[PDB]
mmCIF file with all atom_site columns, C-alpha atoms (C1' of nucleotides) and ligand atoms in Angstrom:
data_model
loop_
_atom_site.group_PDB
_atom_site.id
_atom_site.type_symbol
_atom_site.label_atom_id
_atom_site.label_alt_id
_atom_site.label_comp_id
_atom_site.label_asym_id
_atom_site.label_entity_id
_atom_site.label_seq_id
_atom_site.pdbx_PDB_ins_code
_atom_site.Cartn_x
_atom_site.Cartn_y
_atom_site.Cartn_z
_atom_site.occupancy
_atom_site.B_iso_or_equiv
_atom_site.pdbx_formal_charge
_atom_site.auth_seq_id
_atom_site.auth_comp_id
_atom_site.auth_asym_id
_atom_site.auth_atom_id
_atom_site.pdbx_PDB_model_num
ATOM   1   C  CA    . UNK A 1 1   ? 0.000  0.000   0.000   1.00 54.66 ? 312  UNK A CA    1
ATOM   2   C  CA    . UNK A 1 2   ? 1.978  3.051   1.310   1.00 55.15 ? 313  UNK A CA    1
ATOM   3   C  CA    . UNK A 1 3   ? 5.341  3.646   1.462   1.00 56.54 ? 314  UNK A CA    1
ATOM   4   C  CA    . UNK A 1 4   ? 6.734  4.978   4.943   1.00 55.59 ? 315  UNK A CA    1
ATOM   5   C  CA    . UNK A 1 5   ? 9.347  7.069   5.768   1.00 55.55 ? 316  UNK A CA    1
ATOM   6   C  CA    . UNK A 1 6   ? 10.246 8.372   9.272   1.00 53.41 ? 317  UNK A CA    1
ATOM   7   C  CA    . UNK A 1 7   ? 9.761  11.946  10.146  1.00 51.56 ? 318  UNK A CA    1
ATOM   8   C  CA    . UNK A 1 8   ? 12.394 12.624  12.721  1.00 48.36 ? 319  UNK A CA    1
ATOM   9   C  CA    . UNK A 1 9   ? 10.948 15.923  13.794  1.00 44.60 ? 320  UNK A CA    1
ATOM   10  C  CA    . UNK A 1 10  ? 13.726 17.655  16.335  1.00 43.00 ? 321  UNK A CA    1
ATOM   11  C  CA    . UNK A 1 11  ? 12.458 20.842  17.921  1.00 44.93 ? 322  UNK A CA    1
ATOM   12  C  CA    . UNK A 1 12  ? 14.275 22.714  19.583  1.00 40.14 ? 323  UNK A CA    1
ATOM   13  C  CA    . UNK A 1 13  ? 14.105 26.535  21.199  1.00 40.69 ? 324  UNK A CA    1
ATOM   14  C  CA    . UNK A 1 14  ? 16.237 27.770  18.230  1.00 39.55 ? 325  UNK A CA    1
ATOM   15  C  CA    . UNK A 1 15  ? 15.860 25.687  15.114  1.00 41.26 ? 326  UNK A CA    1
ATOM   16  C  CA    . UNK A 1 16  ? 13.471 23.499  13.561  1.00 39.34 ? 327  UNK A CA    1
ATOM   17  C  CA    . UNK A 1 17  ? 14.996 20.393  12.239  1.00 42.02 ? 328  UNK A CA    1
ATOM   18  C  CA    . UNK A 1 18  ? 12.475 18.176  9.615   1.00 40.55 ? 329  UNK A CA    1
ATOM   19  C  CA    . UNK A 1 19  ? 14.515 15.109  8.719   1.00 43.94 ? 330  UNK A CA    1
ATOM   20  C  CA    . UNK A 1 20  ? 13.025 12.684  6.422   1.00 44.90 ? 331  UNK A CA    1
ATOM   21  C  CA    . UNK A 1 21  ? 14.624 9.312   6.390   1.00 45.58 ? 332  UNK A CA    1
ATOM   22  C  CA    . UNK A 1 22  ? 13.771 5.799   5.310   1.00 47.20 ? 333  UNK A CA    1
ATOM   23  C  CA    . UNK A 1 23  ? 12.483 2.800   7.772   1.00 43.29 ? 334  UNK A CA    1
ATOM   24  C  CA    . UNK A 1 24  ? 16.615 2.326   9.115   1.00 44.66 ? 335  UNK A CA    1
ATOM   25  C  CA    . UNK A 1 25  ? 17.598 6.195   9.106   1.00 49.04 ? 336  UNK A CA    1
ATOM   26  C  CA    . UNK A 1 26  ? 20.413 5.661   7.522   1.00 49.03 ? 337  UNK A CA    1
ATOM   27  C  CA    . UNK A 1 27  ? 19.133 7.321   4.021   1.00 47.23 ? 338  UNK A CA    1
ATOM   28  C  CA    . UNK A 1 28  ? 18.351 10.703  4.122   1.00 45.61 ? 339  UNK A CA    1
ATOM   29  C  CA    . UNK A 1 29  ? 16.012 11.838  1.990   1.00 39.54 ? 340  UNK A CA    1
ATOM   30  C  CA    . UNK A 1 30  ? 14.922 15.440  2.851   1.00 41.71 ? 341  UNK A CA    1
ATOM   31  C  CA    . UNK A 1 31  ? 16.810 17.638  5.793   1.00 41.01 ? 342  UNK A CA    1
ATOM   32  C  CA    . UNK A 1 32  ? 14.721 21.293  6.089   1.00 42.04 ? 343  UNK A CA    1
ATOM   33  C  CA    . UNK A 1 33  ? 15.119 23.544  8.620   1.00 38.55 ? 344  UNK A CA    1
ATOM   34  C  CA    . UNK A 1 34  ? 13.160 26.584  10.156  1.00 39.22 ? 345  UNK A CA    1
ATOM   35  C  CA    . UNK A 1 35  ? 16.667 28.741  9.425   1.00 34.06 ? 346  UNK A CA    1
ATOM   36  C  CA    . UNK A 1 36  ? 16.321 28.180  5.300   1.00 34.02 ? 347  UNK A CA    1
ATOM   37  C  CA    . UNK A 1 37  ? 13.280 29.684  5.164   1.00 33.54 ? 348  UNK A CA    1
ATOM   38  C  CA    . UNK A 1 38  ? 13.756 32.823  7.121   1.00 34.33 ? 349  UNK A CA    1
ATOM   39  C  CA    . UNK A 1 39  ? 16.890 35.409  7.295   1.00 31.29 ? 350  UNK A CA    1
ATOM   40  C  CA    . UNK A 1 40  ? 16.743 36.240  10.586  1.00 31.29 ? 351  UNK A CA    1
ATOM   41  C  CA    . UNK A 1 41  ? 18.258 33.960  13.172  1.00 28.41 ? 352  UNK A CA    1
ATOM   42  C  CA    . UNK A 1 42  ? 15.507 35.219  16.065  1.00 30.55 ? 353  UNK A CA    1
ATOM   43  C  CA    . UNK A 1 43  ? 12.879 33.101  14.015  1.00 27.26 ? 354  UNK A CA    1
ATOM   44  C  CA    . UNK A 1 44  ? 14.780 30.049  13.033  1.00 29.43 ? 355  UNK A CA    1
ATOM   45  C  CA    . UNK A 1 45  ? 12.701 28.081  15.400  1.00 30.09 ? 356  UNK A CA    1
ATOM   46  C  CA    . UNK A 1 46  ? 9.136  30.171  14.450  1.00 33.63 ? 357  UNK A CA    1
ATOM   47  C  CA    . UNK A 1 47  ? 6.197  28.117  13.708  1.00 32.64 ? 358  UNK A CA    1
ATOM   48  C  CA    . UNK A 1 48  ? 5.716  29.682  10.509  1.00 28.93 ? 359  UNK A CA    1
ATOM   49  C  CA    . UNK A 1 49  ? 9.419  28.438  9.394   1.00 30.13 ? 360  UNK A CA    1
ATOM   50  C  CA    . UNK A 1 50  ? 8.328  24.926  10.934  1.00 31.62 ? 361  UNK A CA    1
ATOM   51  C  CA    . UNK A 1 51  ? 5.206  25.208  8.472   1.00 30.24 ? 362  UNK A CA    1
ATOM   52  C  CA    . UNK A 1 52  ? 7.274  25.887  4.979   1.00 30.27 ? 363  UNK A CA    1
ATOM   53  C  CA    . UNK A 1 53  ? 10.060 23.802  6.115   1.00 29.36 ? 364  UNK A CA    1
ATOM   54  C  CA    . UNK A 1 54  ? 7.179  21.143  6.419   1.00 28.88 ? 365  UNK A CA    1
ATOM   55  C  CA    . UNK A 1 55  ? 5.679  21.890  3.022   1.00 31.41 ? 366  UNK A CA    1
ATOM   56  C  CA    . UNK A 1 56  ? 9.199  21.699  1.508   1.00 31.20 ? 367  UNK A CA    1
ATOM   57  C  CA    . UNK A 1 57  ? 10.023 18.525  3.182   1.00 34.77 ? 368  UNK A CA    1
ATOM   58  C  CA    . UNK A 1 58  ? 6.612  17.146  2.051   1.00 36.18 ? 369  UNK A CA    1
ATOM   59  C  CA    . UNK A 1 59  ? 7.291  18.252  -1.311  1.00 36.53 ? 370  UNK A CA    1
ATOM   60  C  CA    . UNK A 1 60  ? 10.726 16.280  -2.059  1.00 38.88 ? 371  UNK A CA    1
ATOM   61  C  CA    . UNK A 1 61  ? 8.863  13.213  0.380   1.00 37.23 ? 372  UNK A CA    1
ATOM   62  C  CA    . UNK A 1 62  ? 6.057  13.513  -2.872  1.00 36.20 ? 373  UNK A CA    1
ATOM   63  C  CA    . UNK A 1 63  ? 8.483  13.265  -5.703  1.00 34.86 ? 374  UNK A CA    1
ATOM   64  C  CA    . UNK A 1 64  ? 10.605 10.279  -4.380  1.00 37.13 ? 375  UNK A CA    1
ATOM   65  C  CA    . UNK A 1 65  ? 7.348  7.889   -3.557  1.00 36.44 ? 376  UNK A CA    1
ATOM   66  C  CA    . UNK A 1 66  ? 7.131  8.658   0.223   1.00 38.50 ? 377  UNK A CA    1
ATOM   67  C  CA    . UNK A 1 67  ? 3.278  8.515   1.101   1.00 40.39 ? 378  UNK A CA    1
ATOM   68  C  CA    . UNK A 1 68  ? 3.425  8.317   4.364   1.00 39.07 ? 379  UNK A CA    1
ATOM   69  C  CA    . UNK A 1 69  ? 5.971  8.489   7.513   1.00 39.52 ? 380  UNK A CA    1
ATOM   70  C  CA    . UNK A 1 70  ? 6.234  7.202   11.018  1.00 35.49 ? 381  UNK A CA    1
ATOM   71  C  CA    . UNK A 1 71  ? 6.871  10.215  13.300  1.00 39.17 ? 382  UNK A CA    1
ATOM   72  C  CA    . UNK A 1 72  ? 9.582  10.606  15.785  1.00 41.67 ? 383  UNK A CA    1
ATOM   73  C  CA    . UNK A 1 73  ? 9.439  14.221  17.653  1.00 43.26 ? 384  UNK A CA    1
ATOM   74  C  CA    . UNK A 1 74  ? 12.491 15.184  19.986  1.00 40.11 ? 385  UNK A CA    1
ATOM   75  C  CA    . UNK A 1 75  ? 13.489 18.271  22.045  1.00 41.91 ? 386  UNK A CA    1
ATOM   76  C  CA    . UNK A 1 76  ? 16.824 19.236  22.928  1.00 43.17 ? 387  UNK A CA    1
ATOM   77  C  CA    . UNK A 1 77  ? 17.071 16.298  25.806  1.00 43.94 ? 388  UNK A CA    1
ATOM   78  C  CA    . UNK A 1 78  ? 20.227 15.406  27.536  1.00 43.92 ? 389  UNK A CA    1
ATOM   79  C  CA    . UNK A 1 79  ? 20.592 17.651  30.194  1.00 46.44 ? 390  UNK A CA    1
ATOM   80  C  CA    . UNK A 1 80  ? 18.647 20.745  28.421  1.00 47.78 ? 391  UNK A CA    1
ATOM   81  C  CA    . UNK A 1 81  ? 15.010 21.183  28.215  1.00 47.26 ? 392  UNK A CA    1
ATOM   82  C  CA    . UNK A 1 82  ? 12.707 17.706  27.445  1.00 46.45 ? 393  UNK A CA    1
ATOM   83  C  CA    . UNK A 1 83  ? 9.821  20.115  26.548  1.00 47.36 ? 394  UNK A CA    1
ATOM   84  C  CA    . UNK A 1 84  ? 10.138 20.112  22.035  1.00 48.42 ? 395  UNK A CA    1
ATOM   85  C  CA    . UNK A 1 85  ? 10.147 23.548  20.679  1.00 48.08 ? 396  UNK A CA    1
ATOM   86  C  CA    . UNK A 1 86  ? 7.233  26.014  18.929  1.00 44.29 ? 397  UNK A CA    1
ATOM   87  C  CA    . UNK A 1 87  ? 8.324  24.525  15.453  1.00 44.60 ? 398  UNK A CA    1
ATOM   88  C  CA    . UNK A 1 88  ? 7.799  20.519  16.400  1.00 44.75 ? 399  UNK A CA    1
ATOM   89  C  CA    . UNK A 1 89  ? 3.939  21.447  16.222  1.00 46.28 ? 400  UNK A CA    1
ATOM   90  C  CA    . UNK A 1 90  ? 3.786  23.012  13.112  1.00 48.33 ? 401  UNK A CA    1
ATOM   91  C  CA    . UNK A 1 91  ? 5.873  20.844  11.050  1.00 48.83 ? 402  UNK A CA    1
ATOM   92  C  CA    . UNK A 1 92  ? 3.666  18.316  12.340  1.00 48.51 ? 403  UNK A CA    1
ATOM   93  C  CA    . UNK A 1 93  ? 0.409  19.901  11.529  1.00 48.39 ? 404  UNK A CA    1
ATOM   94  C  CA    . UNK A 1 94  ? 1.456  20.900  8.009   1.00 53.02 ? 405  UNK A CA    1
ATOM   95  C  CA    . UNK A 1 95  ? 3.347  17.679  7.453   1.00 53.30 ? 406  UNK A CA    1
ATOM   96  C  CA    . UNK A 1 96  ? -0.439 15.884  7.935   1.00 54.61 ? 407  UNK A CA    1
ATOM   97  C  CA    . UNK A 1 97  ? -2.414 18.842  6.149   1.00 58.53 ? 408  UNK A CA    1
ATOM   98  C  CA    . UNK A 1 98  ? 0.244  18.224  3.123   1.00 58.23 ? 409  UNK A CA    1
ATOM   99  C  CA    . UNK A 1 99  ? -1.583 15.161  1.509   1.00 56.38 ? 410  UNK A CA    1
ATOM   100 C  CA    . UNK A 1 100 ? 1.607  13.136  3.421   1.00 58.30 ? 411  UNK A CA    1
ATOM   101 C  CA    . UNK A 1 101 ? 0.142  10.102  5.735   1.00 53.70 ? 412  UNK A CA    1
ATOM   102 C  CA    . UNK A 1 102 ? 0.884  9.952   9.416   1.00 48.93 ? 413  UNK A CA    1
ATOM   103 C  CA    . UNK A 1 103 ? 1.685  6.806   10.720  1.00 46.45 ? 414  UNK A CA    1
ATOM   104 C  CA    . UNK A 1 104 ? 2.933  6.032   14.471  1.00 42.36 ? 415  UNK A CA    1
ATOM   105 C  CA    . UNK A 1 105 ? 3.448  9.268   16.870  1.00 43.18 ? 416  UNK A CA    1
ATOM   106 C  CA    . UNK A 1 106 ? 6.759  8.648   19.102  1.00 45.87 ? 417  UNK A CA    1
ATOM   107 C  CA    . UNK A 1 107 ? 8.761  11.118  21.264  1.00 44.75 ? 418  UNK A CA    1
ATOM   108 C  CA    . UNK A 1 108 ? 12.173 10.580  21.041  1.00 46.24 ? 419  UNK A CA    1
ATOM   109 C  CA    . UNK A 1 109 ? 13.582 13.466  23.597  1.00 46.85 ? 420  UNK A CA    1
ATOM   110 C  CA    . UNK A 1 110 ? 16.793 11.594  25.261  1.00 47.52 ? 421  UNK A CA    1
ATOM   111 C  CA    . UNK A 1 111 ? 16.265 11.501  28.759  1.00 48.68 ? 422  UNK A CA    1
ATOM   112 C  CA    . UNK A 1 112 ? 19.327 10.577  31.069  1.00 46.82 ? 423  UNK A CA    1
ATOM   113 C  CA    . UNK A 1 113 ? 19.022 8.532   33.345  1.00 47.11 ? 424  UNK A CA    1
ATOM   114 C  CA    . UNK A 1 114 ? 20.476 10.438  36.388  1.00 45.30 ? 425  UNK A CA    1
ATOM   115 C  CA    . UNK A 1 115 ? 23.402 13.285  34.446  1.00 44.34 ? 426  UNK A CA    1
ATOM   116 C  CA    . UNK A 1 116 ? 26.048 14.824  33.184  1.00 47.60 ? 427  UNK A CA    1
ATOM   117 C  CA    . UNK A 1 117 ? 26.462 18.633  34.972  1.00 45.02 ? 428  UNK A CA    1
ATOM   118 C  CA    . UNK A 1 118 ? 24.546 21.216  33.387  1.00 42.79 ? 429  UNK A CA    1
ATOM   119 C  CA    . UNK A 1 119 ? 25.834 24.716  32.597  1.00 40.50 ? 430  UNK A CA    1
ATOM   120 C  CA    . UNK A 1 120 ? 24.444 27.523  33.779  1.00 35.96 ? 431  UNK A CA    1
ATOM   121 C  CA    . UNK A 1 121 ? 26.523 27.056  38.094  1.00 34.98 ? 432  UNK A CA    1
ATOM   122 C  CA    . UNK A 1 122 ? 25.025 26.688  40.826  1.00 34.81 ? 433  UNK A CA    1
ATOM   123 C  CA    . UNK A 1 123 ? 23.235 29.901  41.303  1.00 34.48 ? 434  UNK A CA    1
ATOM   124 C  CA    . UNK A 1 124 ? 21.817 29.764  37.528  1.00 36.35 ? 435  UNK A CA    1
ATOM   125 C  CA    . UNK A 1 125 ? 21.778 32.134  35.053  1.00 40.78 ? 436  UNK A CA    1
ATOM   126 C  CA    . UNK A 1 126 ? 21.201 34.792  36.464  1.00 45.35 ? 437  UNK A CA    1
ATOM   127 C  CA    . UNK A 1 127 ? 18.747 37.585  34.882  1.00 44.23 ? 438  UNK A CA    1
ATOM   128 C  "C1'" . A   B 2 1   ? 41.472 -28.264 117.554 1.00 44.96 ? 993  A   B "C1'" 1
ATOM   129 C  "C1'" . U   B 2 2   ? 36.775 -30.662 118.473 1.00 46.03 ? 994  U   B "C1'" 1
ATOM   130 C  "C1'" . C   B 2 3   ? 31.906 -30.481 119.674 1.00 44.97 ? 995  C   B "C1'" 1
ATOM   131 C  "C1'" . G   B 2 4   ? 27.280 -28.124 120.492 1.00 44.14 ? 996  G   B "C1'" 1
ATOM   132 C  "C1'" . U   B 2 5   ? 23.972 -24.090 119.616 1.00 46.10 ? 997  U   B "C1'" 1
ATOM   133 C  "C1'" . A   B 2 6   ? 20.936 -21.225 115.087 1.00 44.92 ? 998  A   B "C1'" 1
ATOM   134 C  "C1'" . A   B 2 7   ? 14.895 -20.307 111.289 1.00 43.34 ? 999  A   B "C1'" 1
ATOM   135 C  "C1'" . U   B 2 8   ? 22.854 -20.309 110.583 1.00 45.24 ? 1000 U   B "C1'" 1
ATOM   136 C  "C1'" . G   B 2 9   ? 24.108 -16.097 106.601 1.00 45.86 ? 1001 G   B "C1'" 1
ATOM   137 C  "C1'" . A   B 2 10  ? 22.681 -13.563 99.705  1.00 47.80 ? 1002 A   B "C1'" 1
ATOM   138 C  "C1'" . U   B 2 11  ? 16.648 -7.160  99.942  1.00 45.68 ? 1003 U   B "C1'" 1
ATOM   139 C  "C1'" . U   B 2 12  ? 13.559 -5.924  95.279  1.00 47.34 ? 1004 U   B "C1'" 1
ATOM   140 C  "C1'" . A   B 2 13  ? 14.480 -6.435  89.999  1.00 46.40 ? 1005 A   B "C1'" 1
ATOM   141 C  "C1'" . A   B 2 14  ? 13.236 0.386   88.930  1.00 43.38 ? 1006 A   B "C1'" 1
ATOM   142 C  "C1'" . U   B 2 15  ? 7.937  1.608   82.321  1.00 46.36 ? 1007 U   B "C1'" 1
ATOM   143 C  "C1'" . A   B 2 16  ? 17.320 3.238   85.420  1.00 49.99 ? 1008 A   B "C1'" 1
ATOM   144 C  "C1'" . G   B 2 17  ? 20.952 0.910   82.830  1.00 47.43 ? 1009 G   B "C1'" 1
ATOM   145 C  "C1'" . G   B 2 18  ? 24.196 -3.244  80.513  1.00 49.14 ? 1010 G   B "C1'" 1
ATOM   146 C  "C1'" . G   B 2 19  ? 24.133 -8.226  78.153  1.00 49.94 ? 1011 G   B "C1'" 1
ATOM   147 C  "C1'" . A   B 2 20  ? 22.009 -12.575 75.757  1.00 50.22 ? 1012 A   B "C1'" 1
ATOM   148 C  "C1'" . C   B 2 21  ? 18.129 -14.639 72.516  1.00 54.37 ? 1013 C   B "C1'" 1
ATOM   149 C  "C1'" . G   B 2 22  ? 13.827 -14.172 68.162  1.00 54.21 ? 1014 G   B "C1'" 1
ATOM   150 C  "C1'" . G   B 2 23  ? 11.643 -12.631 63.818  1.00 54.06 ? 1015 G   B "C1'" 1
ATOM   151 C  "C1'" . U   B 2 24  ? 12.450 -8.476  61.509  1.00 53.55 ? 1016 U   B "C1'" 1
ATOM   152 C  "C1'" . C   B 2 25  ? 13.480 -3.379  59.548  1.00 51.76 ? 1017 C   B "C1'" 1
ATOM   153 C  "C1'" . G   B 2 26  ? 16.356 0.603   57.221  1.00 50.95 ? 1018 G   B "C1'" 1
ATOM   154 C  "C1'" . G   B 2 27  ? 18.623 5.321   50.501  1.00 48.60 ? 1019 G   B "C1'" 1
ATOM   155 C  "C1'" . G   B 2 28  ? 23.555 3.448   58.165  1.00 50.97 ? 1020 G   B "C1'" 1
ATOM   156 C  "C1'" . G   B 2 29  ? 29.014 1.800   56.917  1.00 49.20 ? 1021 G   B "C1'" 1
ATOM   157 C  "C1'" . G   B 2 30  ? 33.214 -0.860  54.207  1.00 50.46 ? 1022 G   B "C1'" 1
ATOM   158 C  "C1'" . U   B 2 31  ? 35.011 -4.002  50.072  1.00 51.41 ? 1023 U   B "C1'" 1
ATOM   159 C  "C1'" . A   B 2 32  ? 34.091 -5.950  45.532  1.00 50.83 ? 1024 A   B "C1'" 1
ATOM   160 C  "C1'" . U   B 2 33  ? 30.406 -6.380  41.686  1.00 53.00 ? 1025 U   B "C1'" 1
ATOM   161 C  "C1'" . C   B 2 34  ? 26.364 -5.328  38.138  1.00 50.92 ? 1026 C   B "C1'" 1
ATOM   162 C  "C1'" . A   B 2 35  ? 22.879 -1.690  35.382  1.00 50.81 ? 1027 A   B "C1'" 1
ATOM   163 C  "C1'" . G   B 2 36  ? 21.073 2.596   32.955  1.00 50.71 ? 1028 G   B "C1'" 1
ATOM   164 C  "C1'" . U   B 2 37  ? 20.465 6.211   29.554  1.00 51.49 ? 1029 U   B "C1'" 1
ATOM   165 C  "C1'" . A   B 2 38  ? 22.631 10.775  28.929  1.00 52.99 ? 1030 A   B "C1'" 1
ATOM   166 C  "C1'" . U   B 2 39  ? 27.150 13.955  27.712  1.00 54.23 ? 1031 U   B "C1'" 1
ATOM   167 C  "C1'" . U   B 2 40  ? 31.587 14.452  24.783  1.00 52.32 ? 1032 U   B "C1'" 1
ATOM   168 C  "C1'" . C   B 2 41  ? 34.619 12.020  21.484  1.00 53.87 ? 1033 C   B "C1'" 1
ATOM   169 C  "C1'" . A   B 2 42  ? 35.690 8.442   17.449  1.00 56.00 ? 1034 A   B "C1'" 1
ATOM   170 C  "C1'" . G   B 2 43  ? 34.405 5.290   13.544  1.00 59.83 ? 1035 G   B "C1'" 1
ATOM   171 C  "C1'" . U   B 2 44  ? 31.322 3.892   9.372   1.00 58.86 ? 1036 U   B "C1'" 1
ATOM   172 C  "C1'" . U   B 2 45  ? 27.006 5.184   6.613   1.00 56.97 ? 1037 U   B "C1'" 1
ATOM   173 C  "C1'" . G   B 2 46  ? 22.986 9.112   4.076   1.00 55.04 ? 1038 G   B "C1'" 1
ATOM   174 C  "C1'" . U   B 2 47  ? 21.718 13.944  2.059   1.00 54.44 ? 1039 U   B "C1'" 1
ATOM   175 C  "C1'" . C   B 2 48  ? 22.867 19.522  1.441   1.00 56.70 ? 1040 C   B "C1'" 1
ATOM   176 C  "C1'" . A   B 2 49  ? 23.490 25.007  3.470   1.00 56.91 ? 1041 A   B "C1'" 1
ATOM   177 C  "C1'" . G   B 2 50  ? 23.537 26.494  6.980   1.00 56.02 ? 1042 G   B "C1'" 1
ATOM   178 C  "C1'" . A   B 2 51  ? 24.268 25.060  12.413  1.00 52.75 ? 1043 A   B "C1'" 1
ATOM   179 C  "C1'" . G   B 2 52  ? 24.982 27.108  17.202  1.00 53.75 ? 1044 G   B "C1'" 1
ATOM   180 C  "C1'" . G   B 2 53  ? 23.610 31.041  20.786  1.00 57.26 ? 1045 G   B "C1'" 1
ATOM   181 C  "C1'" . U   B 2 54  ? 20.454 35.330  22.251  1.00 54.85 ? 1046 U   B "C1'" 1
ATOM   182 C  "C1'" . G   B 2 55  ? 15.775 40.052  24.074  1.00 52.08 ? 1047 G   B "C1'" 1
ATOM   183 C  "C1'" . A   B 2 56  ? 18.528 41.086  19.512  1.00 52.81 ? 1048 A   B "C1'" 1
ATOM   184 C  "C1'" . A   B 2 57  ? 23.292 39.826  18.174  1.00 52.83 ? 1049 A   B "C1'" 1
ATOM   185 C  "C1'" . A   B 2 58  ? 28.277 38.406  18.046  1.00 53.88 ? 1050 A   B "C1'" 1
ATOM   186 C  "C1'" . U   B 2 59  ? 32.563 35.063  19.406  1.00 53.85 ? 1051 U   B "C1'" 1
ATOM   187 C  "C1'" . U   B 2 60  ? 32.398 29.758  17.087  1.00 48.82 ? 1052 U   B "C1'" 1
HETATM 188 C  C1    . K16 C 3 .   ? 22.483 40.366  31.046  1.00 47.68 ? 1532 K16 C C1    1
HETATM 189 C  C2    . K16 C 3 .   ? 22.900 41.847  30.847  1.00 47.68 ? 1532 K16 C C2    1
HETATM 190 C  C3    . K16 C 3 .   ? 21.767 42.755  30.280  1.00 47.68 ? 1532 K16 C C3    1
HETATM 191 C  C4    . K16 C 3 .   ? 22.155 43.117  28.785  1.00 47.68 ? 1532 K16 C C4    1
HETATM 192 N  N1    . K16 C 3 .   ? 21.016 43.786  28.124  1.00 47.68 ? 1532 K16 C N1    1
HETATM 193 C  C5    . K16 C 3 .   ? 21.300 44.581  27.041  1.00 47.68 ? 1532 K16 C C5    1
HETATM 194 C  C6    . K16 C 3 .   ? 20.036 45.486  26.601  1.00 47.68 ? 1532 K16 C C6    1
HETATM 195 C  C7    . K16 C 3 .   ? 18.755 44.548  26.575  1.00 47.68 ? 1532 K16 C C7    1
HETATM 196 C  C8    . K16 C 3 .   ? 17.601 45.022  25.838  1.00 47.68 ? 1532 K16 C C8    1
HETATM 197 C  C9    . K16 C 3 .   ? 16.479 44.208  25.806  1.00 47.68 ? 1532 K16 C C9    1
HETATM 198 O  O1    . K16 C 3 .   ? 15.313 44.633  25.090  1.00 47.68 ? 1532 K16 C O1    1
HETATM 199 C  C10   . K16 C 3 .   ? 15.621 45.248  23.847  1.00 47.68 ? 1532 K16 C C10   1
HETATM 200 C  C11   . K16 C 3 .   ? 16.466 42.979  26.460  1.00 47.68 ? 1532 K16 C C11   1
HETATM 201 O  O2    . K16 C 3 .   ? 15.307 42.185  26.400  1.00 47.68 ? 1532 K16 C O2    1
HETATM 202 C  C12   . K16 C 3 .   ? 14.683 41.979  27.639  1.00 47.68 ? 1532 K16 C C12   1
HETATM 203 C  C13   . K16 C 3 .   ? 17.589 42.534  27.173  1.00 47.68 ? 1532 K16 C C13   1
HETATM 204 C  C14   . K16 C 3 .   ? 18.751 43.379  27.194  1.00 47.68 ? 1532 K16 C C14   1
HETATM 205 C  C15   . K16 C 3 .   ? 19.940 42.851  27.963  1.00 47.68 ? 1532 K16 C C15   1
HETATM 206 C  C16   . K16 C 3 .   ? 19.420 42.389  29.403  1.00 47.68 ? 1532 K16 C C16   1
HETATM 207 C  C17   . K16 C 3 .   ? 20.432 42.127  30.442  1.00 47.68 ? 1532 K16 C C17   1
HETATM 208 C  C18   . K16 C 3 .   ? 19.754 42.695  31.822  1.00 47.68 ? 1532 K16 C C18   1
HETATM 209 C  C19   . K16 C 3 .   ? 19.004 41.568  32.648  1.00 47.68 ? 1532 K16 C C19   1
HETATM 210 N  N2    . K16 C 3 .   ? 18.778 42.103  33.982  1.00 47.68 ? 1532 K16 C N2    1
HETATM 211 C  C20   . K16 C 3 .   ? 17.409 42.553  34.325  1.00 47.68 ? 1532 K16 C C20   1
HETATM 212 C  C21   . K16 C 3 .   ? 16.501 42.868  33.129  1.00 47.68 ? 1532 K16 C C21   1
HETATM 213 C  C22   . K16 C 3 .   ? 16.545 41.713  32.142  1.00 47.68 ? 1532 K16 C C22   1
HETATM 214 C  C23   . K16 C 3 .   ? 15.349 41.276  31.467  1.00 47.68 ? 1532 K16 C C23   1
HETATM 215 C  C24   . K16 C 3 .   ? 15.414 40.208  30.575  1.00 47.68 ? 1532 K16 C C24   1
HETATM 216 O  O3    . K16 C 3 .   ? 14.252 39.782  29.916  1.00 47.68 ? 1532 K16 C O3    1
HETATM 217 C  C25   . K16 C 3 .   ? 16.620 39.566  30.328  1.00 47.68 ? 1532 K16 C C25   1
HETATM 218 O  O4    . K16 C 3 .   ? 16.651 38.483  29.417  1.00 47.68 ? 1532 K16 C O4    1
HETATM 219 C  C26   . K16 C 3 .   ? 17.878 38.271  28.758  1.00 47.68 ? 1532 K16 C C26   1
HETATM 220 C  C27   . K16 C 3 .   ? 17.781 39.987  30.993  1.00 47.68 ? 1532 K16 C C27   1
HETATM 221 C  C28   . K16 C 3 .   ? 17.714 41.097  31.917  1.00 47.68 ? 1532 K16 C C28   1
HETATM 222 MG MG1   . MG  C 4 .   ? 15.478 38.597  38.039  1.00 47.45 ? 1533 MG  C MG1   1
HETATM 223 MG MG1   . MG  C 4 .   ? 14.620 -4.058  84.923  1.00 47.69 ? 1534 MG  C MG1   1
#
RNA sequence: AUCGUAAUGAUUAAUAGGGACGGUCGGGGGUAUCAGUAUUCAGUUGUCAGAGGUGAAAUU
């Protein structure tokens, strides 16, 4: 029937990363990020770059037989924020509204399981 | 020295303490040992123009 990719959606609180790979992830097939459609680094990670970087990725997915992906959103992880960024939401929303077919929803944020110390000191960043 | 007398001679066990013992109970300690993902670094792979960071930037 279909043919599935994996949308390896990683959204963080700069950037908007839309990877589209094959079942394995070792072929990429389409890499578009929030900063290529915008020329100002403050909205890199904007919902409206998430959107065309969606539509773009959605467009090369069309032309190389990828009807439908598996979905794999991330945040930053590790010892930085597990919440995903603005853009994971829209690249999501315009990657289903793009004639694209969703398959399984997974959250792929790496979590430690302890850490690692995180910058910032002991008294935080202070603002 | 022996013998005879005598009711012959030792206070409780403290909701003080100490000790023993019996099933436990603890992220109490020491010495080994076994996980976990993460971080970074490295090796292979895949694409292609940005990535990072910020209030915005810039160093990179
Ligand atoms: C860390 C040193 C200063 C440097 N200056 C330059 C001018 C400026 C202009 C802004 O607006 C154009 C702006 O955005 C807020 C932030 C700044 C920064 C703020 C900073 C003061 C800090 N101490 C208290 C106030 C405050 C508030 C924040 O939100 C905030 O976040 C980074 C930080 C702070
Ligand atoms: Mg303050
Ligand atoms: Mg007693």
């Amino acid at each position: 029937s279909q043919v599935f990719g994996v949308a390896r959606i990683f959204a963080s609180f700069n950037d908007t990363f839309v990877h589209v790979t094959d079942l394995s992830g070792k072929e990429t097939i389409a890499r578009v990020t929030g900063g290529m459609k915008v020329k100002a680094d403050r909205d890199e990670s904007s919902p409206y770059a998430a959107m065309l970087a969606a539509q773009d990725v959605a467009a090369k997915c069309k032309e190389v037989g990828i009807t439908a992906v598996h979905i794999k959103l991330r945040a930053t992880g590790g010892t930085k924020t597990k919440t995903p960024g603005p853009g994971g939401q829209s690249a999501l929303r315009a990657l289903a509204r793009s004639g694209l077919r969703i398959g399984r929803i997974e959250d792929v944020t790496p979590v430690p399981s302890x850490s690692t110390r995180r910058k910032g000191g002991r008294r935080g960043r202070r603002l």
